[PDB]
């Protein structure tokens, strides 16, 4: 509903796989794709978590199987939080590009999903997750809605300004990765 996203002329603030319009931007959104080696994934979430286990605990049979079986994205996530030999410095260096790969597989798997991401044009994309300030901005959709309502200027440009983003928003690695996937999906002829 209207309380589940903010959309302006220049921005989309989304959260969650359920919204009928923007649900597809969520990494929990159900889909189906295969990697080159032929493993099957049912969300971008699950693939990202498999690549985390592969990076830190590659030979762990139980954990590899459990992630490949984790069709429920929240189960994949929790397994990902439990991956052993985790090194944050190393994951922080590599995790954006892993996510961008996940998104390339996901959006490549369905032309309708691809068309939906392209239909967002050049709008800036932000995951409005209150609890995730790495993949999202660490604010809820309601919080963002109050920022807009109290600012005639955000209302005029359709987005919060860069200084505000630098002080108020988390890293939004997902929104950034989606905008890079969207660029990658642009027609080349
Ligand atoms: N195995 C681990 N052991 C230790 N700490 C960990 C571990 N994994 C994560 N951390 C800690 O958790 C932090 C974040 O780890 P990242 O893997 O980037 O993300 P996410 O696990 O939040 O999953 C993000 C996905 O799930 C959401 O739906 C999003 O939208 C994405 O799709 C690290 O910096 C560590 O502090």
Author numbering: -1 to 187
Give verbatim lines from the article.
Modification of nucleic acids by ADP-ribosylation is catalyzed by various ADP-ribosyltransferases, including the DarT enzyme. The latter is part of the bacterial toxin-antitoxin (TA) system DarTG, which was shown to provide control of DNA replication and bacterial growth as well as protection against bacteriophages. Using structural and biochemical approaches, we show that DarT1-NADAR is a TA system for reversible ADP-ribosylation of guanosine bases. DarT1 evolved the ability to link ADP-ribose to the guanine amino group, which is specifically hydrolyzed by NADAR.
Furthermore, we support our studies with the first crystal structures of NADARs in their ligand-free and ADPr-bound states to structurally characterize the DarT1-associated BC4488 subfamily NADARs in comparison with orphan YbiA subfamily NADARs using that from the plant-pathogenic oomycete Phytophthora nicotianae var. parasitica as an example. The ADPr ligand in the P. nicotianae var. parasitica NADAR crystallographic map displayed a bent binding mode in the open active site, with the protection of its pyrophosphates by the basic side chains of K75 and R79. The adenine head, which directs the N6 amino group toward the active site, is stabilized by π-π interaction with Y84 and hydrogen bonds to K50 and the backbone amides of G78 and V81, the latter water mediated. The adenine-proximal ribose is recognized only by the D86 side chain interacting with the outwards-facing 3′-hydroxyl group, in contrast to the pyrophosphates, which are stabilized by multiple hydrogen bond interactions including K50, R79, W89, R93, W133, and (water-mediated) D130. The distal ribose is coordinated over all three hydroxyl groups, thereby forming either direct (2″) or water-mediated (3″ and 4″) hydrogen bonds to E43 and E125. Interestingly, the corresponding residue in P. nicotianae var. parasitica NADAR (K75) does not directly interact with the ADPr ligand despite being located close to the NADAR active site. To see if the hydrolysis of guanine ADP-ribosylation is a conserved activity of NADAR family members, we tested the non-DarT1-associated NADAR protein of P. nicotianae var. parasitica in the same experimental setup. We observed the reversal of DarT1- and ScARP-catalyzed guanine ADP-ribosylation and its inactivity on DarT2-catalyzed thymine ADP-ribosylation modification. Since other, non-DarT1-associated and phylogenetically unrelated NADARs such as that in P. nicotianae var. parasitica can also hydrolyze guanine-ADP-ribosyl moieties, this function seems to be evolutionarily conserved among members of different NADAR classes.
